[PDB]
Amino acid sequence: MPMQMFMQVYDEIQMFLLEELELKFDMDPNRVRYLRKMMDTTCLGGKYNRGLTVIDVAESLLSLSGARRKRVLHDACVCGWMIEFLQAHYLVEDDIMDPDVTVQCAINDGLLLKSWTHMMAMHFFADRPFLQDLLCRFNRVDYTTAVGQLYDVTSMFDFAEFTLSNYKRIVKYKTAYYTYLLPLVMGLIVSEALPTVDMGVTEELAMLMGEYFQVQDDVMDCFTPPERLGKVGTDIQDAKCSWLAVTFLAKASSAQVAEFKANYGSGDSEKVATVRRLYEEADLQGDYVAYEAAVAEQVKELIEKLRLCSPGFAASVETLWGKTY
Amino acid sequence: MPMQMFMQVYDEIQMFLLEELELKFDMDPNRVRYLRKMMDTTCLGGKYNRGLTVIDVAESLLSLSGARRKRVLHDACVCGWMIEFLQAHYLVEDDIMDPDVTVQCAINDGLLLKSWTHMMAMHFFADRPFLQDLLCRFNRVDYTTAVGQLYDVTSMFDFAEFTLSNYKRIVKYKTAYYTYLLPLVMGLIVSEALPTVDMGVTEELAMLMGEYFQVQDDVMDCFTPPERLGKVGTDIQDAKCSWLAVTFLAKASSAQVAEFKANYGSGDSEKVATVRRLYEEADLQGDYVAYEAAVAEQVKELIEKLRLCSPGFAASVETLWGKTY
Numbered sequence: 001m002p003m004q005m006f007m008q009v010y011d012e013i014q015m016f017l018l019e020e021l022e023l024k025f026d027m028d029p030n031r032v033r034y035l036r037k038m039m040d041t042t043c044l045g046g047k048y049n050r051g052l053t054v055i056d057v058a059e060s061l062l063s064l065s066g067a068r069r070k071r072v073l074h075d076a077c078v079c080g081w082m083i084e085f086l087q088a089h090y091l092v093e094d095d096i097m098d099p100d101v102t103v104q105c106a107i108n109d110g111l112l113l114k115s116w117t118h119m120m121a122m123h124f125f126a127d128r129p130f131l132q133d134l135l136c137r138f139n140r141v142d143y144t145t146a147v148g149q150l151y152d153v154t155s156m157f158d159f160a161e162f163t164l165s166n167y168k169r170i171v172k173y174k175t176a177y178y179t180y181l182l183p184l185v186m187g188l189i190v191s192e193a194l195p196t197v198d199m200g201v202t203e204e205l206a207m208l209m210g211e212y213f214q215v216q217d218d219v220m221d222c223f224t225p226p227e228r229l230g231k232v233g234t235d236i237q238d239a240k241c242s243w244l245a246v247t248f249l250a251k252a253s254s255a256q257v258a259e260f261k262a263n264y265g266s267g268d269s270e271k272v273a274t275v276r277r278l279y280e281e282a283d284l285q286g287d288y289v290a291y292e293a294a295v296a297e298q299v300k301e302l303i304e305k306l307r308l309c310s311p312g313f314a315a316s317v318e319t320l321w322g323k324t325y
Numbered sequence: 326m327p328m329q330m331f332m333q334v335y336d337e338i339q340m341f342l343l344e345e346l347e348l349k350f351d352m353d354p355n356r357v358r359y360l361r362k363m364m365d366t367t368c369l370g371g372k373y374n375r376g377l378t379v380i381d382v383a384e385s386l387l388s389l390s391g392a393r394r395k396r397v398l399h400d401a402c403v404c405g406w407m408i409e410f411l412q413a414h415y416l417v418e419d420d421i422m423d424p425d426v427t428v429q430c431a432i433n434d435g436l437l438l439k440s441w442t443h444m445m446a447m448h449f450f451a452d453r454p455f456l457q458d459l460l461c462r463f464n465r466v467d468y469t470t471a472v473g474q475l476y477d478v479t480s481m482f483d484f485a486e487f488t489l490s491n492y493k494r495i496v497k498y499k500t501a502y503y504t505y506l507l508p509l510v511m512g513l514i515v516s517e518a519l520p521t522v523d524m525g526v527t528e529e530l531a532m533l534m535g536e537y538f539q540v541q542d543d544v545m546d547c548f549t550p551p552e553r554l555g556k557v558g559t560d561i562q563d564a565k566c567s568w569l570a571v572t573f574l575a576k577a578s579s580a581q582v583a584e585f586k587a588n589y590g591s592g593d594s595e596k597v598a599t600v601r602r603l604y605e606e607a608d609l610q611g612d613y614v615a616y617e618a619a620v621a622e623q624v625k626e627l628i629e630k631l632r633l634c635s636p637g638f639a640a641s642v643e644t645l646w647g648k649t650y
């Protein structure tokens with residue numbers, strides 16, 4: 001029912017956007033079908049974790065606070081696709097990084113996907129009292145993500161910033177705010193129960209869940225083989241500020257740091273193996289299990305503090321936490 | 326006084342954005358100075374025609390409708406820099422088209438410039454009654470521009486679309502709405518006198534002025550030498566849907582069309598000269614003077630219809646039209 005309703009609202013959103021281009025923007029059918037195929041390619045196929053999180057938060061707050069139910073659930077699906085379209089926009093920008101008309105279309109796709117989040121919100125929420133506050137929180141989180149991207153891209157340009165506090169800064173602004181905090185907040189807005197929650201504990205939980213997700217993703221990027229990871233792990237070659245790098249530098253000897261700095265950030269298949277060997281010899285996979293266990297306890301305890309004043313809201317946070325756990 | 330006040334509000338806007346990153350987004354000084362230099366490089370140096378147009382429309386509507394004057398003029402400067410930041414955002418995307426970290430920073434610059442239009446609006450207009458309507462009209466025009474870019478990039482992919490009505494469609498959506506209609510509308514919003522104008526004649530005037538500007542720009546791109554044009558004219562090599570191309574195809578013989586199709590869209594220095602020769606032999610520069618004269622008369626007459634009900638508002642439109650004339 002959740003996934004089925006989510007995909008049913010997707011057809012409604014796509015039909016409005018494409019028909020609007022046909023009726024108001026004077027677009028020809030060849031380009032309307034072109035944009036339909038592009039919208040399906042970039043927005044459909046993932047796991048829809050961000051979008052479905054908005055629905056799970058909304059359905060809990062209406063049963064644990066009747067035509068208002070049907071409207072809130074529909075508003076959550078539109079908010080769910082706002083984030084999915086936003087995530088589609090971010091991924092398109094990633095492909096541009098890694099008279100050329102395909103690059104021209106890629107940039108155009110990114111601009112269109114971002115604009116579509118505004119267009120679908122200005123339409124389905126035209127008479128909602130929260131349209132202005134929803135767009136401001138949405139735009140501020142998008143700005144936060146762009147700032148987080150700047151922290152990540154320049155993590156090796158200005159190993160000084162290879163610290164655990166800067167790693168959390170990258171994770172907080174580039175991933176945690178739009179993946180964990182935003183879907184939870186959007187569920188509170190469509191349920192109108194925004195000021196009834198502790199935003200401090202909620203913001204704190206969103207950062208810890210994103211941090212837990214990123215550390216696990218960093219270790220899998222280095223040790224999980226490509227066919228089991230779904231991609232080629234490239235953090236070492238790209239010299240990323242991963243959890244493995246900042247944890248190695250704190251417990252390595254003065255020589256192992258020199259051997260790390262001489263082997264990190266290279267495409268040589270053996271230097272990457274030299275970095276993996278250094279990670280192995282430091283028992284980082286053992287430190288990984290302990291570091292994640294401590295984060296998980298901070299998550300388990302913070303959900304209880306949020307349950308005291310927002311009982312039903314914490315049930316969805318545990319469901320969201322289970323997807324990462 | 327107009328330019329001096331405009332640059333004075335620029336320092337105020339930049340200081341707020343950078344300090345916000347320092348105080349709220351936990352940004353280090355090295356990156357704050359990096360973003361200051363980037364903001365100056367992309368937003369400063371142009372002619373500020375879009376930004377100053379908002380000021381000229383605002384100052385006319387307050388004298389020809391007193392602490393409200395100082396607020397409206399300041400609100401117009403913020404709106405003026407919203408468009409300049411938006412134009413900076415579009416130009417950055419143009420450079421991307423024509424582990425690489427400079428391309429990564431270019432994409433990041435484009436996302437930051439667009440977000441800054443929202444951030445400066447959500448701050449300086451936080452208590453303005455038009456904040457929601459300003460962001461919706463701003464976002465819809467931005468979406469329009471992205472649609473216009475799609476019409477332009479695909480003008481030769483799907484010479485079928487090389488028609489005069491499709492040329493106006495490209496000019497209307499890609500240039501006219503955000504360069505001519507948006508600065509005029511933003512001047513009406515900060516002056517609160519939006520519903521006191523004929524939006525039909527205003528929209529019609531904005532499209533004609535953009536069309537007049539684009540035709541003149543197309544002819545100069547082909548005939549004005551590089552040192553006098555400020556750039557290398559590349560419309561023929563890029564096979565653009567220029568006014569010269571769609572006018573040639575309507576008055577050329579069946580063979581000249583074949584010679585045009587065989588020479589258009591190539592980088593060969595002689596095929597480009599063959600296309601220029603075909604443009605010369607068709608007296609297109611003579612048709613250019615006549616076509617622009619007819620557009621100018623439509624502009625002169627439409628400003629009079631707008632003066633009947635909006636007298637002071639038409640004075641700024643004539644000033645904006647003079648910059649293109």
Ligand SMILES: CCc1cccc(N)n1
Binds near residue numbers: 091094145149
């Ligand atoms: C465009 C850079 C970016 C930011 C956030 C997420 C993501 N995948 N990519």
Ligand SMILES: CCc1cccc(N)n1
Binds near residue numbers: 419470499
């Ligand atoms: C990014 C494509 C574009 C659109 C409008 C104007 C401009 N210069 N560039």
